[PDB]
Ligand binder design. Structure first.
Ligand SMILES: Nc1nc2c(ncn2[C@@H]2O[C@H](COP(=O)(O)OP(=O)(O)OP(=O)(O)O)[C@@H](O)[C@H]2O)c(=O)[nH]1
Ligand SMILES: [Mg+2]
Lengths: 175, 1122, 431
């Protein structure tokens, strides 16, 4: 990780530690230097606009070979400086609404299910709730994106994410 | 297909055009629907002839309306084009309109077309053809224009002028519209007025196009092809006195264009076409003074037969045939003589196809003279047998096709008396080919020619008799032509010696092994219709071919000799005479030198060594099955040796021909031992019986695997009279191999073959009650059953997969072969415990997850259960099994399909004795990896659990059996994860909903401890996930088990692997969302938030606090570091 | 300079080939006129592998169109890129086959095989170093699959030292309503198991499900299936069409991905999944792309790699990324003690890097797996073979042409043996 920076600090370094350097090596080291120092370039007052680029002096003294790379392979985008956060269970849950075409007088129930939840567990939950057998509960869904187009959930070993389920969908239970 | 049974659908689809032309998804759907409906009649579109008009008019009232938008008009023209590709334009355009009021409406539509619009090419195609069907009008284009000086300032352009400017522009395009431009000019320049007005202009344009264009620039080649096609069509559909004036300049330009040397197949074909179109303009049409250009045309068309492509050869042949039909009878002989030069020795096979095509074209018109019969025929006899190998590929198919075509064209080229001299060489050729030809196209090509010959002429020997049997459909299967129809044809004396000669000469020396085997099997039957000719003429022939340097020829000749010997022995066996009556001393003397002439030339090495070994083994088997007179002669000692060496070098044989080699060697050994190793009636030779048996037994311990595999089957093929007092040793030697030793761990094929060998030996000797070392008796029957059952638990799993399963297969076919034997001799030997164990093992091997072994097991079970003569005694719930699998339903069952097997196998749980094994076998499928098998097994298991869920007794016994199976396979990696997954599924389905009522059930109290002991110190990710799921499903049981499961779920939440940490929380969330009574509502909004906010994949030290906090909420004691 | 002769038989095969050619024409930088207006040196670095060198710098494809009817041959000739193809590269007949394997393999197929081999040899002779042959066709039709198998056998007999690739397409009831599609599917599989080196299984049931659910299409047509197939094909041959540090050889790739000569069937996948028209959505990172490409949802086959065993895996990325990132990701995925551990990626993936992403996307990834789960597909059609062969339904169409019930039994036995070998090797120790 440091070697790539050294080659990125010198422009005519064709050999380092008794090892020849190729265009592939030069490009790898130049892409790593931009991937590592993009975030700081935004905070230092950087912007892709060729007339709104106003960087400070400390960032230039620490990275005096970052402006040439900005023109060699363009400036880093906003979608390239957001890779430093992990995931939580809160960010895997899907808020859906439970409906019953046979019983419309019932209230609109809402639940939160994981993304990797199999259809078997959902069927078991519905059976334990409505007290209906598992073999007598068929499952479908509808999305605000595709209205009036019902899909079937005949396979039980699959997950909700495989069926392209997303936040905001609505499940329909029949028996 | 008798009629169009989709009229309403097509009508509705056509009517929906006016309300689907604004759609992009529905438009494509309707197009794809119209295409699949019309493609059904692509092989016989004539059935749609009665409908053409109505559909055409429908599509026309949409493109012939003034309120029609461009998009709607484009779909109608696409449909119109779809009907012109299936019926074709030449036949579908005759119904289009042709009234004088359709000349300007169609030319004006042609003048609003976008040439750069590639999406609307069908529109332009349909436009040009319509404009061309409107140039037939019998009036001058001048009468239609009326007055051109009506528009002051700018005069209107004439209709004929516009059409000339439309054709010239479309004749240089790169889409399919250029082909529609070729059909337009053909009906534009070939009329009177246009001929006098624009013919010179169009000719100058074409001569300029072929004077500036090239075959290298892409657009240049586009300009060349279109111009050549237009010129060819004009010269074809053009008057001969308006054209002949321009034939001199067209050929002079084509000669300078240099087409033969150009690297384009289409350009050369069109060029040859244009050359043959100009050639007939110089001669007068005949109905059956030679300018100099005719010689140049012939010299060009005789060089178009040696082309490298068949598309040009066919055109050259057609041109030669059309030219010969117009020239006088004198030049016809010279043309035929020049065309015959294509069949020279230096000429390649490509030149032969063109020559035969030209000969057929000449014969179709009846131009060949009688003097050309002794020569032309002499060539055809060879063209029908053209089949050479040029390196790695074969050639001769097109040659034989053209030969059959020429033969089919001789039924009208000569009188019945003119061709009377060659009805003995051509009838033999046709028949021979139609019978032995390799390709099916040639065979049916020879079948049609013979039919035409016997129909028109009818002078061939037995024409109707040979045509009735060898018909178009009878010669479909090649196997039927070699073994059946061949004998029927040989029944007559006119098709016996020639066919046998053709088979022994070429087919025996063929390059394909299957063809050689088929020819040998055909000669086997043909020898019956001619024993003397096959014993006095064919046998010396094949015997001399066994000494050939060619490997394939040697193999074929050896096979032919063996088959002829077997046929002669079978034929002689009828009259009760020796086989030596047919073969002479010299013949039986040469059958004792084949193997010594091969072993002395070292012809058993290399890739041909296996083929030579196979041939010699087949020959030895056929000679031993005939009782030949080689007893006492040392030659026998040779044959035997050649067998042993094979069993010693099986690993040298390729992996694609070792099983067949071993089987053939075993069969030869069996045929030899039961013929040349018998001292007296019922006894055997003491020296050989001892030496062979000792050698084979000592060979079983060779560390090599293939050697043991071969010697096993060798022992399993010896006769019964040679084991009258050595069974106690052979059985022990075979059982010593069936055992799995530390060194023979991955040696499964050896035991698989030993089991099969024990089956065969037990079947041969039979049962004799009292004689242990002679036959299967009540003393050596238990040991056999114990050795066979010890190979049923072979679950050896290596880097090659579950190879042990193979052995299990040998245990299902072997154990059967023994049982069925005892019932047919001494049923008392079939003990009750042994039969019950065999049945339970068969049940377990029929409830497996693999589909081909499971299917084999069910068939064996049905065969063992459907045995009534006599009925196998001691069958648990025999009546129950019989009612569950009735004989009527077994006739159609897909045991290999899990759907048609698991619901029928799950019912066996009802029987106590089967309930345990059947479940142990079904656990692997319920917890395997196959998705379809898992689904089917789970469905079939729930369908049976639904019948005993409300029964405390049945459900309790089922749970006890499941837990006993789990305990018996404790710490077993092959049964731990699958059974855990099965338990997880059963718990998720809610089958044990009755035990969840009370507290602390004897079932879960020990199931949880067993799961803990199974998952204690486990690194496998799949095992950890299965354990977590089981511990997250077992929470439904209240009592101390719930608190212990919660403590385990808290312990697992803080595992070494962050993936496990996340999965445990993800599953605990679902478990809490499912069962609400496990946690009260006072501490429920405190658990979900901690599980959703806490990042279980972060630092473990930080997650320990959150995890410990979830132990103070759930009420679980907080563990510590021991 | 390794040249590969492209081939495409049947309507579906011709359409897939035309779509793939039109897709790669925009990536290489060759206008439909037949010239190169590309501005990248990397484009012309390996253009000879699929294009010939003619006068005036005009690039001519190496494709060979073949059919038994002319309709589809005419549609491609007038397509957007119908001029680059040579006029004499179009071989066709008139009657077709009729959804019958015997009529498209033994009669019309063997009748037009001569004219097809003519052009095949004419094209092969114009190559400095021929590497192998590629064919695009289907398995639910007569002409297509029949002529495909016949041409494969002929090229194997005449050129045993050449590699063979077949992007066969498996039919599905949800796309076609023909009853004799199982028989033709079983015969083509039997022929390919004997005369093939690589077979990219492209199920027509997975593509339909993707177009219906993922793309959220009301009534998907062949245009939503051919685009996906062409995208997957372009993603597969990314190394064979552009430079790369990884070995981009076809023979070595097949040898590494064909450890078993009967289990040479490969399931192909590609993320992110896009439709027609709308393709510029966002730029997914390397982790997201690797998670989506190995997902059963982005699989062109109806089988899930998770339900089996990973024998060989080949991954190819394209966009603006360094090999170090892919290596670190792939090494951390298999690390059981890391925070990014999964359970559907083996411990050895042949990763590749490229700097030429497809059109409308900044980054893309392709995956090819020799997993045993493909056996499930082989069992999906087999069941149908039992619901017809036992009843002898439509058997007079095959026996009347020349075929024997002995050919059907042999094909069924071969399929059963293949399935058994797959299921047996699926239970091998992971040492
Ligand atoms: N994905 C896809 N499948 C197609 C397409 N066209 C046809 N198919 C499938 O191909 C199978 C057989 O049809 P084709 O390949 O068109 O037929 P052919 O191979 O030309 O054979 P013949 O009709 O006998 O001449 C069917 O199962 C169709 O569903 C296509 O464009 N895309
Ligand atoms: Mg078709």
């Amino acid at each position: 990780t440091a070697r790539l920076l050294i080659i990125a600090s010198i422009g005519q370094l064709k050999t380092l530690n008794k090892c020849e350097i190729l265009p592939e090596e030069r490009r790898r080291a130049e892409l790593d230097y931009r991937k590592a120092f993009g975030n700081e370039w935004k905070q230092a007052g950087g912007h892709k606009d060729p007339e709104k680029n106003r960087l400070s002096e400390e960032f230039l003294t620490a990275h005096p070979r970052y402006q040439f790379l900005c023109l060699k392979y363009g400036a880093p985008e906003d979608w390239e400086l957001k890779t430093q956060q992990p995931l939580m269970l809160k960010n895997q849950l899907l808020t859906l609404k439970i409906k019953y075409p046979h019983q419309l007088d019932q209230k609109v129930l809402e639940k939160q299910l994981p993304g990797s939840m199999t259809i078997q567990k959902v069927k078991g939950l519905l059976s334990r709730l409505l007290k209906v057998p598992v073999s007598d509960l068929l499952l479908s869904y509808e999305s605000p994106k595709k209205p009036g187009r019902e899909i079937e959930l005949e396979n039980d070993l699959k997950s909700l994410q495989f069926y392209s389920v997303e936040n905001g969908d609505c499940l329909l239970v029949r028996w | 297909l008798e009629a169009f049974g989709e009229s309403a659908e097509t009508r509705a689809l056509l009517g929906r055009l006016r309300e689907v032309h604004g759609g992009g998804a529905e438009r494509e759907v309707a197009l794809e629907r119209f295409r699949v409906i019309m493609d059904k009649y692509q092989e016989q579109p004539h059935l749609l002839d009665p409908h053409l008009e109505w559909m055409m008019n429908l599509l026309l009232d949409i493109v012939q309306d003034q309120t029609s938008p461009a998009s709607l008009v484009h779909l109608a023209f696409k449909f119109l084009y779809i009907i012109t590709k299936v019926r074709g334009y030449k036949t579908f355009l005759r119904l289009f309109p042709h009234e004088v009021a359709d000349v300007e409406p169609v030319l004006d539509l042609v003048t609003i077309q976008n040439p750069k619009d590639h999406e609307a090419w069908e529109t332009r195609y349909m436009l040009l053809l319509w404009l061309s069907v409107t140039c037939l009008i019998p009036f001058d284009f001048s009468r239609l224009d009326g007055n051109l000086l009506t528009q002051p300032g700018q005069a209107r352009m004439s209709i004929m002028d516009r059409i000339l400017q439309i054709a010239e522009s479309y004749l240089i395009v790169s889409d399919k519209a250029r082909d529609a431009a070729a059909v337009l000019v053909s009906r534009f320049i070939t009329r009177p007025d246009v001929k006098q007005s624009k013919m010179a202009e169009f000719l100058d344009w074409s001569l300029c196009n072929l004077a500036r264009s090239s075959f290298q620039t892409m657009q240049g080649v586009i300009t060349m092809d279109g111009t050549l096609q237009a010129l060819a069509q004009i010269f074809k559909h053009g008057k001969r006195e308006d054209c002949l004036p321009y034939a001199a300049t067209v050929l002079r330009c084509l000669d300078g264009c240099r087409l033969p040397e150009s690297n384009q197949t289409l350009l050369r074909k069109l060029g040859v076409k244009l050359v043959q179109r100009l050639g007939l303009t110089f001669l007068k049409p005949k109905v059956a003074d030679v300018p100099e250009g005719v010689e140049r045309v012939i010299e060009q068309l005789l060089v178009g037969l040696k082309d490298k492509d068949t598309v040009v050869r066919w055109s050259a042949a057609k041109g030669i045939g059309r030219m010969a039909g117009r020239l006088p009878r004198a030049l016809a002989d010279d043309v035929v003589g020049s065309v015959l030069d294509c069949f020279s020795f230096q000429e390649t096979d490509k030149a032969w196809h063109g020559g035969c095509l030209a000969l057929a074209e000449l014969g179709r018109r009846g131009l060949l003279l009688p003097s050309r019969l002794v020569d032309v025929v002499a060539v055809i006899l060879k063209a029908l047998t053209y089949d050479e190998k040029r390196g790695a590929c074969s050639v001769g198919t097109n040659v034989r096709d053209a030969a059959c075509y020429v033969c089919w064209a001789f039924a009208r080229a000569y009188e019945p008396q003119e061709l009377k001299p060659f009805v003995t060489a051509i009838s033999s050729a046709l028949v021979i080919a139609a019978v032995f030809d390799r390709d099916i196209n040639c065979r049916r090509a020879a079948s049609a020619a013979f039919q035409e010959n016997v129909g028109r002429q009818g002078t061939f020997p037995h024409g109707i008799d040979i045509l009735t049997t060898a018909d178009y459909f009878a010669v479909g299967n090649r196997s039927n032509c070699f073994l059946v129809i061949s004998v029927f044809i040989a029944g007559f004396p006119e098709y016996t010696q020639p066919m046998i000669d053709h088979l022994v000469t070429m087919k025996i020396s063929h390059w394909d092994g299957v063809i050689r085997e088929l020819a040998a099997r055909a000669l086997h039957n043909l020898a019956q219709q001619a024993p003397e000719f096959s014993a006095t003429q064919v046998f010396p022939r094949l015997l001399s071919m066994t000494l050939s340097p060619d490997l394939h020829m040697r193999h074929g000749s050896i096979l032919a000799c063996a088959e002829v010997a077997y046929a002669l022995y079978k034929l002689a066996a009828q009259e009760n005479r020796p086989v030596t009556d047919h073969l002479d001393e010299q013949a039986v003397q040469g059958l004792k030198q084949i193997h010594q002439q091969l072993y002395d030339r070292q012809l058993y090495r290399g890739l041909g060594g296996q083929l030579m070994r196979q041939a010699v083994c087949v020959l030895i088997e056929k000679l031993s099955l005939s009782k030949m007179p080689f007893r006492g002669d040392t030659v026998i000692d040779g044959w035997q040796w050649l067998i042993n060496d094979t069993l010693r070098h099986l690993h040298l044989i390729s992996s694609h021909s070792r099983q067949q080699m071993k089987d053939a060697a075993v069969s030869a050994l069996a045929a030899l031992c039961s013929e040349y190793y018998m001292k007296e009636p019922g006894e055997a030779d003491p020296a050989i019986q001892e030496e062979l048996i000792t050698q084979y037994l000592a060979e079983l311990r060779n560390p090599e695997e293939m050697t043991r595999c071969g010697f096993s089957l060798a022992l399993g093929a010896l006769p019964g009279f040679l084991l009258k007092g050595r069974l106690q040793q052979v059985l022990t030697g075979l059982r010593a191999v069936t055992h799995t030793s530390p060194e023979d761990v991955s040696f499964a094929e050896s035991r698989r073959d030993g089991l099969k060998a024990i089956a065969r030996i037990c079947q041969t000797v039979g049962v004799k009650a009292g004689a242990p070392d002679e036959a299967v008796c009540g003393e050596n029957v238990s040991q056999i059953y114990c050795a066979l059952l010890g190979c049923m638990d072979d679950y050896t799993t290596d880097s090659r997969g579950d190879v042990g399963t193979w052995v299990r297969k040998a245990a299902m076919t072997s154990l059967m072969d023994l049982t069925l034997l005892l019932a047919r001799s001494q049923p008392e030997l079939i003990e009750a415990h042994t039969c019950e164990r065999i049945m339970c093992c068969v049940a377990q091997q029929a409830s497996e997850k693999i589909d081909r072994f499971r299917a084999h097991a069910a068939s064996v079970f049905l065969t063992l259960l459907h045995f009534d003569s006599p009925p196998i005694p001691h069958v648990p719930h025999r009546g129950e099994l019989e009612k569950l699998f009735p004989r009527s339903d077994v006739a159609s069952v897909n045991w290999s399909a899990p759907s048609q097997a698991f619901p029928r196998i799950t019912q066996l749980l009802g029987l106590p004795t089967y309930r345990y094994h059947v479940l142990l076998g079904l656990v692997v499928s319920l917890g395997g990896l196959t998705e379809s098998t898992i689904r089917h097994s789970t469905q079939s298991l729930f369908e049976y659990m639904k019948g005993i869920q409300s029964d405390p007794q049945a459900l309790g016994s089922f749970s006890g059996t499941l837990l006993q199976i789990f305990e018996d396979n404790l710490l077993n990696e092959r049964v731990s994860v699958p059974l855990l997954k099965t338990l997880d599924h059963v718990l998720t389905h809610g089958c044990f909903d009755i035990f969840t009522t009370e507290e602390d059930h004897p079932f879960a109290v020990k199931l949880l401890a067993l799961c803990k002991k199974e998952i204690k110190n486990s690194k496998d990710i799949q095992k950890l996930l299965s354990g977590i799921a089981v511990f997250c499903e077992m929470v439904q049981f209240p009592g101390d088990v719930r608190r212990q499961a919660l403590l385990q779920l808290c312990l697992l939440l803080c595992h070494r692997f962050p993936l496990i940490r996340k999965t445990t929380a993800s599953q605990v969330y679902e478990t809490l969302l499912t069962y609400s009574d496990v946690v009260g509502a006072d501490v429920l909004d405190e658990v979900v938030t901690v599980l959703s906010d806490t990042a279980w994949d972060a630092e473990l030290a930080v997650v320990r606090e959150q995890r410990n906090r979830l132990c103070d909420l759930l009420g679980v004691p907080r563990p510590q570091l021991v | 300079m390794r040249e590969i002769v492209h081939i495409q038989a049947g309507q579906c095969g011709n359409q897939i080939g035309a779509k793939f050619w039109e897709v790669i024409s925009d990536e290489h930088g060759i206008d439909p006129t037949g010239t190169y207006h590309g501005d990248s040196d990397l484009q012309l670095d390996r253009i000879s592998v699929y294009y010939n060198e003619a006068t005036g710098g005009k690039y001519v494809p190496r494709a060979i169109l073949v059919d038994l009817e002319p309709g589809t041959m005419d549609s491609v000739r007038s397509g957007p890129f119908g001029q680059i193809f040579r006029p004499d590269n179009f071989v066709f007949g008139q009657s077709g086959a009729g959804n019958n394997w015997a009529k498209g393999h033994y009669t019309e197929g063997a009748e037009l095989v001569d004219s097809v081999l003519d052009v095949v040899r004419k094209e092969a002779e114009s190559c400095d170093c021929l590497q192998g042959f590629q064919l695009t066709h289907s398995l639910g039709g007569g002409t297509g699959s029949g002529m495909g198998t016949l041409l494969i056998s002929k090229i194997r007999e005449e050129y045993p030292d050449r590699i063979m690739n077949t992007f066969s397409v498996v039919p599905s009831p949800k796309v076609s309503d023909t009853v004799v599609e199982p028989y033709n599917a079983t015969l083509s599989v039997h022929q390919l198991v004997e005369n093939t080196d690589e077979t990219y299984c492209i199920d027509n049931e997975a593509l339909y499900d993707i177009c219906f659910r993922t793309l959220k299409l009301t009534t998907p047509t062949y245009g939503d299936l051919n685009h996906l197939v062409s995208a997957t094909m372009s993603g597969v041959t990314t190394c064979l069409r552009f430079p790369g540090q990884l070995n981009a050889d076809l023979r070595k790739l097949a040898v590494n991905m064909v450890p078993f000569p009967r289990l040479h069937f490969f399931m192909p996948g590609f993320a992110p999944l896009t439709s027609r028209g709308s393709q510029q959505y966002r730029a997914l990172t390397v982790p997201e792309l690797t998670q989506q490409v190995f997902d059963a949802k982005n699989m062109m086959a109806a089988c899930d790699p998770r339900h089996g065993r990973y024998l060989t895996v080949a991954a190819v990325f394209r966009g603006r990324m360094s090999m170090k990132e892919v290596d670190e990701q792939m090494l951390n995925v298999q690390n059981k003690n890391s925070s990014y551990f999964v359970e559907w990626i083996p411990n050895n993936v042949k990763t590749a890097v490229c700097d030429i992403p497809p059109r409308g996307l900044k980054m893309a990834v392709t995956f090819i797996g020799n997993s045993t789960a493909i056996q499930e597909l082989f069992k999906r059609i087999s069941e149908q073979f039992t619901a017809m062969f036992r009843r002898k339904a439509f058997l007079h169409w095959y026996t009347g042409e020349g075929m024997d019930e002995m050919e059907f039994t042999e094909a069924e036995s071969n399929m059963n043996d293949l399935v058994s070998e797959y299921q047996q090797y699926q239970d091998a120790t992971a040492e």
